[PDB]
Design a protein around this nucleic acid. Structure first.
Lengths: 108, 212, 108, 212, 108
RNA sequence: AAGUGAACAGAAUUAAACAGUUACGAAA
RNA sequence: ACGGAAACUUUCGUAACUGUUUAAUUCUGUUCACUUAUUC
């Protein structure tokens, strides 16, 4: 969950990451706005935001080279199919926060 | 003593300008320079932060005697109109703007329009080759009104400088019409025009003298 | 909705797609400008844009070979007749984004 | 101190030109590059972005001392007139353009006209064969004017060379008359003509020197 | 409007239509220059273009046999008399696109 | 009466992406 | 016929005063509507 996030994210390629935290404010805006809203109502009611969350990880993957190299390694599209319950979705929301904390520790 | 003077006016856009909205936060159409609009409807609204910073900029270059090195520190005759973060005598200003909304929807739909904002295509020349980097921007419509209300109030003690403050607000609004407003106005996109400049009293504590 | 759009769009013919996301900005400019406007007013009020939206999928289908091969496979003209309600129109607007994000996932 | 000089002029078009508008974005007629027009009416307006990239290009090849290779980096006598993205001394430009609108509609219908835009048949020949690719374009009207306004202002310190800047703007506008403006004007489409080049003072802070 | 035009235009006679897009570059220019001009000023002011549009469907209709066969089927002269208001004229301008978009769908 | 299918490239980039004046006020 | 009886951590007070998501920017570089033709 959070133990493998320190080794898989560090093992990359060339140093000096050109990607910061401002250019990734688009795909990281729906992940934080989903964990705090799925606990109020049921999971079968919100059927428009679930299908739209997968689109953000596809349209933004073919524009910048600093996006495709991270999704294929962290397996983001693989966990989008296993989830189906409200309790399972709560676990995926916590895994996204691990890829951001360890990213700013080695650089920015 | 304590009155609430309201300077109601209609901002008529004689030329379509551009305002940089929240990029990488909207829907799938986050490219082509997304313009900020209404968070509920689709009517484009103009923010008030671009008006308070632009009016103070053009005012702090003709009514002063020292080059402004840092904000909230330039002269004193205009620091009490917008505010001061480094002064200990006064803090709250006397000019409050408002996020004006496009109130021209009563007759805009009768003419049959396609959308509220269009996409304009532009590019640049590297002075060594032909067309390079086909970029694109986004603009608004032309000849649109906006309900602009200026909340003006006095602090009772500042009563002997009322007529002196009226000539400063009128000079700032007239000078703003001869300058671009918003963003990317160097090519000729801004240049607003305040239409129907009048004043009224809501709280009712001060007489009505000025108008135009 | 989004599961069957990743396999039908990939199954095409010859590789190296010569059509980019900039030459199809005509038929895609009205669908994005209709979803944000239909959520405000009613559906029976806007009657001049519904009939004009279907014309874009027919006039642009005989001027380029890279358009007819996509409409007949994705079945775009079939969904234009089933819609009749404001809630049903919101579903067709989300399906159009799958033909744009997944199109640039394998190339551009 | 701070003045607002306005150079009012009438851009008379001696020959109908063509300007490539927003491609694949029109209404009922989007054939052969639809020319950009007004988002409210139908009168084709000229964009102000073409007047800034063409006038600066023709001026940066006669008043310079080094071959330019990228924008915002050519000599120094003309960098303060349009802008500079590298120098930290100045960032804002002193020249403000405006989307000139066609004010000739008050008497254009009296001469008996059909429409504002027509389709001109112009193709090409592949030399080795007969007619190949019968393309076409879309031009505007001929012998039309535009109410153009040039908003000029000084920054107080820029006062000991006011007369030096007047000979640069006058030479730049006169040189543009003998060159095509817009797009694809190599076949004799552009060639503008600035009519009634006068100056006036709106803010009223500087005397009137030039006139013709 | 657009539903009954896809079946009436297809039902013709012999295939391989000789009427291409070259002989229709005269009557399709006044209709496109009417919807964009009637929305600005009033309808009572434009009097030299309304009566001139009906002449094009009378003089030019007798110069070729491939013109009268399309006007009588699409009923163009019938709608020229019912229109009288600015809002009604906007409806006839949208119907002209059905005879051009759907014409190139089966050939060109 | 007379083959008429605007062709071919780049699909928004390089600065800067929290700066400062500063914290339980008068009772048991 | 109880180390128990009797008891508001209470009143107090906008996380506040200043700020243009913008500086730089030609949707155009090449382009005959045409080969053939006695209003007798």
């Amino acid at each position: 969950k959070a133990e493998r996030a320190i080794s898989l994210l560090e093992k990359d390629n060339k140093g000096n990451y050109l990607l910061t935290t401002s250019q990734i404010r688009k795909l990281l805006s729906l992940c934080s706005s989903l964990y705090d809203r799925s606990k109020e109502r049921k999971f079968d009611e919100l059927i428009n935001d679930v299908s739209y969350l997968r689109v953000q990880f596809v349209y933004q993957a073919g524009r910048e080279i600093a996006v495709k190299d991270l999704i294929e390694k962290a397996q983001i599209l693989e966990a989008l199919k296993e989830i189906k319950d409200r309790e399972t979705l709560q676990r995926f929301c916590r895994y996204m926060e691990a890829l951001v904390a360890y990213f700013k520790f080695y650089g920015g | 003593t304590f009155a609430k003077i309201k300077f109601s006016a209609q901002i008529r856009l004689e030329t379509g300008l551009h305002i940089g909205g929240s990029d990488a936060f909207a829907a799938i159409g986050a490219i082509a320079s997304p313009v900020i609009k209404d968070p509920i409807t689709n009517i484009p609204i103009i923010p008030g932060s671009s008006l308070k910073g632009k009016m103070r900029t053009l005012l702090a270059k003709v009514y002063n005697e020292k080059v402004a090195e840092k904000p909230s520190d330039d002269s004193d005759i205009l620091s009490r109109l917008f505010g001061n973060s480094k002064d200990k005598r006064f803090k709250m200003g006397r000019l409050i703007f408002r996020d004006a909304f496009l109130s021209n929807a009563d007759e805009l739909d009768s003419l049959g329009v396609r959308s509220y904002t269009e996409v304009k295509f532009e590019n640049t020349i590297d002075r060594i080759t032909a067309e390079a980097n086909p970029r694109q921007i986004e603009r608004a419509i032309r000849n649109s009104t906006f309900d602009f209300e200026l909340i003006y109030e006095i602090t009772d003690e500042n009563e002997n400088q009322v007529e002196e403050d009226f000539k400063v607000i009128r000079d700032g609004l007239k000078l703003l019409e001869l300058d671009y407003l918003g963003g990317s106005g160097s090519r000729g996109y801004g240049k607003v025009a305040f239409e129907k400049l009048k004043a009224t009293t809501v709280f009712g504590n001060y007489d009505v003298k000025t108008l135009n």
